[PDB]
């Protein structure tokens, strides 16, 4: 009596969670902008009214894809230039003691060594300035990486400047954005929208501080896969950036040594003028206000009448124990002791100066046996960055304890991309559907 | 109309709307379903999109619904697949909820559809034989 | 090319007629001068300016036609 028959509907607005390969869109660099699709000057956003979708930032395939793409790009950029195999030799070093500050005693070592000449049967006695973190004693010293693996010199004309990257899916796939403010990184999002692809995400590398990122809209945002678990990192997104001014003022001089046929090694010859430590300045009042907002948002998940103390990093590698980043080619490791040192209880032009150490031998990712040597940057170097986020780790403690201690953390770069891709998921369209109708062919 | 703006309906705009209302916006979905490390993966992205579109077009064709948005078919709807009424589904349910409901009956429906299309082709051949 | 033909309803047809009228300003030549006195290359060169607008006209005409067909089949 009903006379119900199948009717095929094409273009049905239905999607499904899926994983696909997202290409690059954007406007010599490690990140290949020349080999990317040109972005639409007028991005086309759509509000998915009457829609609710469940998001989970901590299991997003986009983060893993971005990590893999960045690692592949870094591997690609380091291939077509010299590998410093012959650099591993005994180094006769002396302490640099001319025009130095009391805080830079022993940091720089003036090391003389023999080096291979363009001719295979000749040697040249050369000298170079090496940071103390790069040399280990056997007066005799050797590069730290020698007993681990050979180091590949960074291509000199290749720039390390982050460039925004748009991860855009193929046709038949869309990206869902959660525009709901006060979002928690896991669960339903009442305010969902669909996009062709995302905004410009700069692949900024940083530990203990998220630099040049995206800021929150309403207030400081606390995110964690499991806040009750002390083994899960806490990601904090600021609403207002904090200006940080980093500088190495040594007037470094770069010299080229012919280490073979068509192979050049770039060494730090001498520093013009006084030698003093690199550092980073952070506004004291702005940082205090930011930490006040952070503690206000953190007390919501740990109690209102609980002491919240910010302390130093527990320990480990130099990458995680200090704020490690790259600025203008140089690799800074800053002792963030004056920042995370305070306690909070429920109730001027000066700034905090963090000393920083420069390193040339770089173990960029969490890998053993793949090290990089950064050629020195000529002249004074200074740059300014926007602290827009934070990575924290909660100390173990116990339930009986009435205080919660949070220390800076990082190391894993998956969190850095997660902080930018938290409001994004990928879905595949399913335009074919079958419904019952009283129609007959 | 002199003073009037243009509200262009968007892609997947009627996802949360009821099936009856969402069936009126099939075009905005169907019209744009095809359109060193970066280039190599762009290539396979293009290939994936092309093959997905071609498989969808083949599935449409083998059911006799090629080049159509709404295609009335001759196979009856078995009540065991869904006991819900027409007014229930077409006014109190979205397309996504319907897909979740009948996710485990799609293959049988597709097989019946293609079998019926083959039978219709055979019947047309027999009719043309006279 | 196949989808461009399909969005006009000309799927699988080498020669497909359409309801779009031929506006005079596109070409003032008669049928005899077009189909018996010049080739296709000269034609394409002539109507290169009016190609996208014609394509949009055919596209919207086919859209209207399918909407009307759906409305008629609804009853």
């Amino acid at each position, epitope marked *: 009596a009903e006379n119900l028959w199948v009717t095929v509907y094409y273009g049905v607005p239905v999607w499904k969670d899926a994983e696909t390969t997202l290409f690059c869109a954007s406007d010599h660099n490690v990140w290949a902008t020349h080999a990317c699709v040109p972005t639409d000057p007028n991005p086309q956003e759509i509000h998915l009214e009457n829609v609710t979708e469940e998001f989970n930032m901590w299991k997003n395939n986009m983060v893993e894809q971005m990590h893999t793409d960045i690692i592949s790009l870094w591997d690609q950029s380091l291939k077509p230039c010299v590998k410093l195999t012959p650099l591993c030799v005994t180094l006769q070093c002396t302490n640099v003691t001319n025009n130095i500050t009391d805080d830079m005693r022993g940091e720089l070592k003036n090391c003389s060594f023999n080096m291979t000449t363009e001719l295979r049967d000749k040697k040249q006695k050369v000298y170079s300035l090496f940071y103390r973190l790069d040399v280990v004693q056997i007066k005799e010293y050797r590069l730290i990486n020698c007993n681990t693996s050979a180091c590949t010199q960074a291509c000199p004309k290749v720039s390390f400047e982050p460039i925004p990257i748009h991860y855009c899916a193929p046709a038949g796939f869309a990206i869902l954005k959660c525009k709901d403010k006060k979002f928690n990184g896991t669960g339903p999002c009442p305010s969902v929208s669909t996009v062709q692809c995302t905004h410009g995400i700069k692949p900024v590398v940083s530990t203990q501080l998220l630099l040049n990122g995206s800021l929150a809209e309403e207030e400081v945002m606390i995110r964690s896969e499991n806040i009750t678990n002390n083994a899960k990192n806490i990601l904090v997104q600021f609403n207002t950036p904090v200006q940080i001014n980093c500088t190495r003022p040594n007037n470094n001089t770069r010299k080229s040594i012919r280490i073979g046929p068509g192979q050049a090694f770039y060494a730090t010859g001498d520093i013009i003028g006084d030698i003093r430590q690199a550092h980073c300045n952070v506004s004291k009042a702005t940082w205090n206000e930011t930490l006040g907002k952070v503690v206000k948002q953190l007390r919501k998940h740990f109690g209102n009448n609980t002491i919240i103390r910010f302390a130093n990093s527990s320990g480990g590698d130099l990458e995680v124990t200090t704020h490690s980043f790259n600025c203008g080619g140089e690799f800074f490791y800053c002792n963030t002791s004056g920042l995370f040192n305070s306690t909070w209880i429920s109730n001027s032009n000066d700034s905090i100066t963090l000393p920083c150490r420069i390193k040339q031998i770089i173990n960029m990712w969490q890998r053993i046996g793949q090290c990089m040597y950064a050629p020195p940057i000529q002249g004074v170097i200074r740059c300014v960055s926007n602290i827009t986020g934070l990575i924290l780790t909660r100390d173990g403690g116990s339930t009986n304890s009435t205080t919660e201690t949070f220390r800076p953390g990082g190391g894993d770069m998956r969190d850095n991309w997660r902080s930018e891709l938290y409001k994004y998921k990928v879905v595949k369209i399913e335009p074919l559907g079958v419904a019952p109708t009283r129609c007959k062919r | 109309a002199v003073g*009037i703006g243009a509200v*262009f309906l968007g892609f997947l705009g009627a996802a949360g709307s009821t099936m009856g209302a969402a069936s009126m916006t099939l075009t905005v979905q169907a*019209r744009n379903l095809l359109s060193t490390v970066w280039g190599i993966k762009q290539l396979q992205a293009r290939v994936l999109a092309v093959e997905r579109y071609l498989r969808d077009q083949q599935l449409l064709g083998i059911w006799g619904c090629s080049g159509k948005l709404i295609c009335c078919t001759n196979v009856p709807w078995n009540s065991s697949w869904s006991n819900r009424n027409l007014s229930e589904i077409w006014d109190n349910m979205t397309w996504l909820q319907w897909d979740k409901e009948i996710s485990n009956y799609t293959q049988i429906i597709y097989g019946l559809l293609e079998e019926s299309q083959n039978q219709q082709e055979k019947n047309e051949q027999d009719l043309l034989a006279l | 090319d196949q989808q461009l033909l399909g969005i006009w309803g000309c799927s699988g047809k080498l020669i497909c007629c359409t309801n779009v009228p031929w506006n005079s300003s596109w070409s003032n030549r008669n049928l005899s001068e077009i189909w018996d006195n010049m080739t296709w290359l000269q034609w394409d060169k002539e109507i290169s300016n009016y190609t996208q607008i014609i394509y949009g006209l055919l596209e919207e005409s086919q859209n209207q036609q399918e909407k009307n067909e759906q409305d008629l089949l609804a009853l």
Partner: antibody
Amino acid sequence: QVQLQVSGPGVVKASETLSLTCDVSSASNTRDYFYWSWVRQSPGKGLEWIGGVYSNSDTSNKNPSLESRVTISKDTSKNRFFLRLNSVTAADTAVYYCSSRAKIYFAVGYDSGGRIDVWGPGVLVTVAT
Amino acid sequence: DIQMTQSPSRLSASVGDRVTVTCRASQDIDKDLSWFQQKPGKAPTLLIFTASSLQTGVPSRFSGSGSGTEFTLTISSLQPEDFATYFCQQDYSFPLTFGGGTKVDLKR
């Protein structure tokens, strides 16, 4: 669905500038353009169109009678629009409504045959002395 | 400016009666004129656009006809909620000229 809310001073002195602000809360983010217009109704009289402006372009259109006295501005970033009337007289005491007009399309050219033509709750403006 | 004249200025009808209103322009404006309804102390709500198309959510009892200079609004079955002022607005060319309003009151 788009929602309109208007605001402004309920009493304006004669020969002053009457400023009304109407804010819009919608768009579905699809980069539409609406037409934001103002219409007044005097007590015991019919509706009269003051003017309007597009939501994306600076093209603003005015009543020839009120061309010299009306100025319409907009803020698309904050999603609002403002009407300013100069040389207000006793005849301008009226209920002011702010409106958004739009046309529904499937694509650029594929008109679907629908509009919204929404009107705000309105506010009474009295020209006292 | 294009002048709109609406008739009858006022009318009385009971529930279930048929009501007709005529809106006439000063020149040909094609089918570009919308019919609008406004309740006391409320904003106007769209009833009909392009003189023949019913807005979404409007009861089907409302209808519109005519073209050129003369257009007509018809209510087949008057209801208690329909007692509101109706007006006719042109949009063929600037300026947008409204109708004179059509107040309808309950019969007694």
